[PDB]
Symmetry: C3
Subunit: 320 residues, 3 copies
């Protein structure tokens, strides 16, 4: 209902209804702007401090361009802070940003940094991507889906891959929408029960289904939208030179799609990586790989517009 000033570190602390709103706004903006083509200065007179711990181009591009499109001014900062060298405690740095940008999209290596960064700033902080989550992404993913099926009502998502931030986010959000989760990670990377125990709790209070395993073609069974993501995040070399060959046996391909439902569709946050998917799937007109990618922009805008304005979506809320 009201999101202005509410920083976004992860969907966990977010009522489905809230997330839904965002998506709505996203959809409002994408249409009102991309479809109807009008100019929306919602963000005129506002500045976004984008902190990038690691070169994350794509995200920026989208963000930058997005924040700008609404007439805002995206300010790009790399390691001028506690990312690379930094001589001051970010517990101060926040102050500055609190005075300069009126919102911060940060992409850091540790959630840890985020909460502090947030709790130490009179400015809403946005999880541009942490080691534990990636809200704004699934945010788009969902939007994308909703657009394709025109309802997230009760579709069952299918996760094939290692247990990273993404999957997590899904968990912290799939159920809120009323969607079914079907996770599948190698007996080595189950996601810290800390969260899963949570997802199962969300699923209970929503009536959604949830279950996970180590066998893919069992998570991508009745899957409406099967989702995957590289397991080789480049975390090491020894931890894949033979470690991620114990991770072998996943490489989502049509062999999977087959077991998948009929409505079946495919998601992935990019980039490519022939390791966990063949062109067969990835390029199948059933994969919303690119539209997913696109939406990142519309979502992030809405997100901002969400926390920086009193706006209010023109256009009837979509059916979720």
């Amino acid at each position: 209902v009201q999101l202005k000033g509410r920083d976004l570190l992860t969907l966990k602390n977010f009522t489905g209804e809230e997330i839904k709103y965002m998506l709505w706004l996203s959809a409002d903006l994408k249409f009102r702007i991309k479809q109807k083509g009008e100019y929306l200065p919602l963000l005129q007179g506002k500045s976004l401090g984008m902190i990038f711990e690691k070169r994350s181009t794509r995200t920026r591009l989208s963000t930058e361009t997005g924040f700008a499109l609404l007439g805002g001014h995206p300010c790009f900062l790399t390691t001028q802070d506690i990312h690379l060298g930094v001589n001051e405690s970010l517990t101060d740095t926040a102050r500055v940003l609190s005075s300069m940008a009126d919102a911060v999209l940060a992409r850091v290596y540790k959630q840890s940094d985020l909460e502090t960064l947030a709790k130490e700033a009179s400015i809403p902080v946005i999880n541009g991507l942490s080691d534990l989550y990636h809200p704004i992404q699934i945010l788009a993913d969902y939007l994308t889906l909703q657009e394709h099926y025109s309802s997230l009502k009760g579709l069952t998502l299918s996760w094939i891959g290692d247990g990273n931030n993404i999957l997590h986010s899904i968990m912290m959000s799939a159920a809120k929408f009323g969607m079914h989760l079907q996770a599948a990670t190698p007996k080595g990377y189950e996601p810290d029960a800390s969260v899963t125990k949570l997802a199962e709790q969300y699923a209970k209070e929503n009536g959604t289904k949830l279950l996970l395993t180590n066998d893919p073609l069992e998570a991508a069974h009745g899957g409406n939208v099967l989702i995957t993501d590289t397991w080789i995040s480049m975390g090491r070399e020894e931890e894949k030179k033979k470690r991620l060959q114990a991770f072998q046996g996943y490489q989502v391909n049509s062999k999977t799609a087959k077991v998948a439902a009929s409505a079946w569709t495919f998601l992935h946050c990019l980039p490519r990586k022939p390791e966990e998917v063949d062109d067969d799937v990835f390029y199948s007109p059933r994969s919303l790989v690119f539209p997913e990618a696109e939406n990142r922009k519309w979502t992030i805008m809405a997100v901002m517009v969400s926390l920086l304005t009193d706006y209010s979506p023109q256009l009837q809320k979509p059916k979720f």
Copy 2:
């Protein structure tokens, strides 16, 4: 007449009338904005993806500032793509840009990259400078000239220098305007007959004159505007340690200006380089070195406004 959505990779595939229009628009914008001083949000709500294979500051500055002046948002990308490292085929990268920026000004090392980049994107791509051409530059050059002589009607341009992208562009365009070309390159760097054969063809269907040689003071004979450009593009070291001493005997100076016509004027895309010109010429009030430089901005704007808007030039078309 209509240019919206038409990407610009080189004047080759461009009716003179079309180029003229651009110039016109340029002149419209420069006046309506720089002379009358009004603000023109033509580019409000639009974003430009500027890809720079190599640090090309000047060009950017102009572009950036230009695209911005019209209320657009220039997005600056370096090697986050298939310029330096890149893990994905640009045949996809284009997709992203097609979704993010609604136009791309790229400055690459190979035309090759450009066409593909263009043919693989629902977005107009602009030759920010390739190894084979440099449209937007001569574009300004021309504008500059037109301004100085108030007509390109039938002046004869004089080329003294190696046969690079620039000269090429001129070729692919001088005649369209009805101007005479007088090229002069060392018996080592004649421009691949592939293009010249073309220029001679354009000259035939326009009635313009065209001829080239290896003797400068013979190309800069009746020359109205003599144009030159560094031969030392920094392509090598061995290919100039003695190779470009076989290129000796050009260094355009007043000795040239003398043989030049009376209306005579001087062009050069910068930067300095005492190798192919003395301050005598370069700084002569007859050299439009700087105004040339300036125009880059007005032209590029028009170019954008050309492909991104339905605008329509207020102010009577200039006499070309």
Copy 3:
């Protein structure tokens, strides 16, 4: 009264009345924008060329965001010029900038560069920070003060620290406002009498007081606002490994505050540096460390708006 087009290299050549105006405008903008919350496109259609000899993040952030907030377009340039490599004489470079940005905020290592850069450009040049001054900073400092005491009328400032650009600027300006200076630098770093001789002259024609010494707790005596700043600017290593231990005996702390007046307050341009101040002072609610920092933005805007517009401050001038 009129400042448009007047470049700002240092408060020296600036009537107090002029500086005051700026501050006023600053205060006008901060209020009209930050307090009343309206959007002010004063800088729409204008571009700022920001040259940074050395990575100066903070300053930029503020500037960038500021110039943008007023609807201007900040253009960020690093060493694409005579900062690092540069192949052309800046005496030309200026020309370009004169054609691209319609104003330049430069942060260089030598004043020297600035005057030339300025005298060679039909564009106002702004001292983003030189080795000799730092106008825009004290500019904020003053603003900050004025806000806290609601008058600079006749307070006595207290300088404890080495004799750098900052102190200088204060000197070149404190008296113009009618404030008392009380400098204190180690018997090794008195500021070149060249300037001090000047400050004493300004103090004479204003009736303000001025005196300096090498004993801190003697400059921060009746001090209303005591100001300090790191002595370790990182100029060397040998020049501090034992050289700035001969600089020992300053480290402004409450022991100082005590001798300070009652109205007493504390200033510092950041960053931290436990060498010349303990958290005791620095974090005392009597320190305007952060507000100082913030103001940098409002001031710089006003500065720009000052030299780029005919604006005119809505809201009664503050009492100085």
